[PDB]
Design a protein around this ligand. Structure first.
Ligand SMILES: N[C@@H](CCCC[B-](O)(O)O)C(=O)O
Ligand SMILES: N[C@@H](CCCC[B-](O)(O)O)C(=O)O
Ligand SMILES: N[C@@H](CCCC[B-](O)(O)O)C(=O)O
Ligand SMILES: [Co+2]
Ligand SMILES: [Co+2]
Ligand SMILES: [Co+2]
Ligand SMILES: [Co+2]
Ligand SMILES: [Co+2]
Ligand SMILES: [Co+2]
Lengths: 314, 314, 314
């Protein structure tokens, strides 16, 4: 599998700025090295340099819209470039708002992509439904074609064009969804597997249906947006919006192992890892370690084992 | 959903007296407020004042029988009253012995009720089978019609009349059952799902069968007696009789979310929460928080989300 | 059920010597007493005294081959003796290398035995595939008939005769398998349920298939080799090779409860418990406690309860 690593040290989609350290701690944990330890072809396109936009007052309640909108616009470009290089874009980012540019850039090359959004949240608040104003909780609303007409023209996002339909996305792990967000869920008929469905069906059936749902009619490129708060904070504590009762370490690896096995993974986001929020140096390493393990699984690392195409017994 | 809150600060069903603080810490955690934050109609009937019965020597091995028997008799009355007010009785109690009065009072109004008992124990010891003498581990024996004839006339329980049949109760979560208790299980043919069955079937199937079992022939009012030690102590540590290998936070919420969805919940007990037993201030908050989350789920709070009947996108 | 307890304080199959304390801490936790508390017939054949083999240089990369080979040869003899006494051999050991002698001795009496290997590892490295040289990670390679011809004549194992076929063994819990080990897995067609399969099917189906797999054609004696690192280190931290994402306390007990229920358990190993590796006195007790609970389950202790064949209500 050939990857296109892209560091995205951004945080203006939410209050806490430690998420910008994401690319740093992840790379320093040997991610690139570990990918190469596998049969992975890796090209690191570096960390995107997000220049400061000192003048960026709120748009109504929406915070740092110009900074956010510009970082996603830039990202979208780098992603598109890697997708043109015939590589799977791996976005080691800051907050989840970056998803807007990652998915957008991906769709430019493969407009028929299907999205898997693992998160404890749906992040589909509109600028009028969000109560926090944090954009890392509204990325999905900017992308849905069905929602084009409700989203106001927010400074910094003029370049955006909704690229995915409500039927081309599956949510897995939900356990903290706002009222307006849930209204949108049921109204647009979005397919989701909240923690209740996971508990009911088991992660195997959940993944079986998710993949059947998105790859029913035909095979299409898959984009996986992975918010680390989708996993229980007993696994990923150094994250800004933890919610108890999350997916287990195992369920996290099962999800990714199944996605990889599709052979259709083409876009991947690893978001919301914030070292600064770790209560102890071990919570940080535990969060980073869990984050790396999930990434390796997306590119082939299997729990049952791996082996090159040779005769080990000779 | 309309609730009838009833505080039951009682502890004489067992040794440790910190359980009496149950109503206090639960209410102070905003339970009433959080219920109102939902579409819940709440009337708090206050904390029942249990006067001291200084003269209450053991009956054979059975401890504090008069104190226990009187608190359940009183409770039964308050429950019946709330059930007559057309409200779902919510009993924030002390020890599980109170179940005797809660279920009894409930049955007075709805004699056809079905019982779901979530606990790590079966609490069906008779005064002759119990080895500890603690009544919080014998409540079920006073209620079963099938057992009427074996239970001795214990001071304080003359007012009791067995109200439920062995076939109108399901156990979920069992992992610490005494020999005589197990003998009673198999002999009366009581339906139960111990941790082994949960592991075997999954919580979804367990709940599917539990509800099919109790609501097969017809729909009937449901009484949920929830002992917090049914959940693993990694979730509810501040409890008197913890047993490892318990139901998860998720399984706990799944159970309740499914019960609520029946629309038949009419009686609820939240028992054995003892702040005094928390090893740290966080074990207390973790136990209380888990206790509140389970209660909210019984009245509609869903992990996938909630929304009023309006147009959020306008 | 009648047991034949055998202490095996050995550690030369790996670096750390604290595993030799296994028999000691296990017995001192009341294991023999607790077995008797059940309807178990127990005869403790004592702790095998492994004399020092001061002169034992590496064989290529393989470490302490003579010490290891001799301890398994001795063990095999004691096991065979207990199996001749019509008792179920219970091997409280040190490292997993001892499996070589336990299974070998067992097969002498019941050559048709079936093996269940619960571990986070496959321990099927050959002296030429192992990279660590630690024999506790190669035991399975000495036993497989299919592998006879690749394994070099290692000092200390001249007495060995491969006793099991690749089709008479099931692995459960795998999550850290070496490349050569995985090559062997797929090539010999060994049946296994890694953590991925557990996640996919559930432990109930996994056990259903494992037992159907080994007891399909006919009923045969079952040998359970239980490496405590098969369970998540949140349960068994005092172990030499911990790997996160392991089987839960519940899954561990479910496995054993199901094996016991077969009535065919005839050989049992409880390996890799190392007190010296516990970060705190509680990690040690937690590891030992978990180890005892699993053993009791193999001999009848059920979570739903137990009761003698009498009338408890009289
Ligand atoms: N729904 C909340 C929290 C969303 C959290 C964003 B996320 O999932 O990216 O961490 C909000 O709108 O602020
Ligand atoms: N079976 C034990 C323990 C029962 C625990 C009571 B419970 O479930 O309410 O906490 C006894 O009879 O003392
Ligand atoms: N595969 C590694 C680790 C095996 C661990 C051995 B065991 O499972 O017994 O703990 C090795 O060969 O050194
Ligand atoms: Co999130
Ligand atoms: Co998110
Ligand atoms: Co209990
Ligand atoms: Co109870
Ligand atoms: Co192992
Ligand atoms: Co092993």
């Amino acid at each position: 599998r050939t990857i296109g690593i892209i560091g995205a040290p951004f945080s203006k989609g939410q209050p806490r700025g430690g998420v910008e350290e994401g690319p740093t701690v992840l790379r320093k944990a040997g991610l690139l090295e570990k990918l190469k330890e596998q049969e992975c072809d890796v090209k690191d396109y570096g960390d995107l340099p997000f220049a400061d936009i000192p003048n960026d007052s709120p748009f109504q309640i929406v915070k740092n819209p110009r900074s956010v909108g510009k970082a996603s616009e830039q990202l979208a470009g780098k992603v598109a470039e890697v997708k043109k290089n015939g590589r799977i874009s791996l976005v080691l980012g800051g907050d989840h708002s970056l998803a807007i540019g990652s998915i957008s850039g991906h769709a430019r090359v493969h407009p028929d992509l299907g999205v898997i959004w693992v998160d404890a949240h749906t992040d589909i608040n509109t600028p009028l439904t969000t109560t926090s104003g944090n954009l890392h909780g509204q990325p999905v609303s900017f992308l849905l074609k069905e929602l084009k007409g409700k989203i106001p023209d927010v400074p910094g996002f003029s370049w955006v064009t909704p690229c995915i339909s409500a039927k081309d996305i599956v949510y897995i792990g939900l356990r903290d969804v706002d009222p307006g967000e849930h209204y949108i869920l049921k109204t647009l008929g979005i397919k989701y597997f909240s923690m209740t469905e996971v508990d009911r069906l088991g992660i195997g059936k959940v993944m079986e249906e998710t993949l059947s749902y998105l790859l029913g009619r035909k095979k299409r490129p898959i984009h996986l947006s992975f918010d680390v708060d989708g996993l229980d904070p007993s696994f990923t504590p150094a994250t800004g919006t933890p919610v108890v009762g999350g997916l287990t370490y195992r369920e996290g690896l099962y999800i990714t192992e199944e996605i990889y096995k599709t052979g259709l993974l083409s876009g991947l986001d690893i978001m919301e890892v914030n070292p600064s929020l770790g209560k102890t140096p071990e919570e940080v390493t535990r969060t980073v370690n869990t984050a790396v393990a999930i990434t390796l699984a997306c590119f082939g690392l299997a729990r049952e084992g791996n082996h090159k195409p040779i005769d080990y017994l000779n």
